[PDB]
Design a binder for this molecule. Structure first.
Ligand code: TUX
Ligand code: CL
Ligand code: ZN
Ligand code: ZN
Ligand code: ZN
Length: 266
């Protein structure tokens, strides 16, 4: 694969799911070897694990006093389309959640790619590796292509489900929205988050009900979204990844922990 960028600057705006504030993104084209980096109030924040500052309910990056919340969905979409060089100008403190998935991001960026002059320097999983955390576990091993599998165990009716993404099946996970359980909400609201969450950007699930009148987009939309989240967090490795990943009840914190590990020994 060749490094890629966008043909022209792309704009996305809307409310951030956690800040409740309105924000805007401007994806600017960059040259080969530039990498992926965010831009806010004069500072450039590399989409790398060294800059992660929060992993509860979202993955946030920060540097020199500037923080950007929820970079995972845009990062995931970017990772899936192999865009390797762009500056993401952020006007606000959080990426717009939009519809909760990566559809609007995917559609736009997809029909605006620009192949550049350089073979992508993929991050390859050389040796196996596993990170655990009281019940949770993420196993990563060598693979020619990107293969991500998430297996969740829900207290609710979804029971236990697992979904697998393989290169070429991008459209199967880009439409999977952000989801939360009614019982989580009071907590998320208490800790200062979810200020911008509604049934328009979040899929709310009860012990046996789906609050959204629209319903689920797939019988397993939640695990598909967890795969989507993990693919976004993986991009924090600095470059497109190739490897077989299996996450069991994984999340951002653990996702980020796996990356830091993969970074160390490889
Ligand atoms: C009450 C009746 C329904 C209408 C009211 C809806 C209220 C919505 C409140 C805000 C919801 C925020 C969703 C959210 O933070 O999901 C989190 C998820 C985020 C994510 O997708 N990251 O990529 C990451 O994993 C954690 C769990 O570890 C999830 O909690
Ligand atoms: Cl929490
Ligand atoms: Zn190539
Ligand atoms: Zn919390
Ligand atoms: Zn998400």
């Amino acid at each position: 694969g060749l490094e890629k960028t966008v043909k022209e600057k792309l704009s996305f705006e809307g409310v951030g799911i956690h800040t409740g504030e309105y924000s805007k993104l401007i994806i600017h084209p960059e040259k080969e070897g530039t990498g992926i980096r965010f831009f806010k109030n004069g500072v450039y924040i590399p989409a790398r694990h060294e800059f992660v500052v929060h992993t509860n309910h979202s993955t946030d990056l920060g540097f020199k006093g500037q923080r950007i919340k929820t970079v995972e969905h845009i990062l995931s979409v970017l990772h899936l389309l192999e865009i390797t060089n762009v500056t993401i100008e952020v006007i606000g403190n959080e990426i717009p959640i939009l519809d909760g998935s990566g559809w609007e991001f995917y559609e736009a960026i997809r029909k605006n790619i620009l192949n550049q002059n350089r073979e992508i320097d993929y991050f390859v999983v050389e040796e196996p590796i596993i990170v655990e955390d009281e019940g949770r576990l993420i196993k990563a091993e060598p693979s020619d292509t990107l293969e991500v599998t998430y297996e969740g165990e829900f207290k609710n009716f979804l029971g236990r489900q697992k979904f697998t993404f393989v290169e070429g099946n991008e459209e199967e996970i880009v439409l999977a929205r952000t989801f939360a359980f009614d019982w989580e909400i009071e907590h998320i609201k208490k800790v200062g988050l979810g200020k911008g969450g509604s049934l328009k950007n979040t899929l709310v699930l009860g012990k046996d009900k789906v609050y959204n009148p629209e319903g689920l987009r797939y019988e397993n939309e939640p695990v598909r979204h967890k795969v989507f989240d993990l693919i976004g967090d993986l991009y924090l490795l600095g470059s497109p990844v190739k490897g077989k990943f299996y996450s069991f009840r994984g999340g951002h914190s653990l996702n980020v922990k796996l990356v830091k590990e993969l970074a160390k020994k490889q």
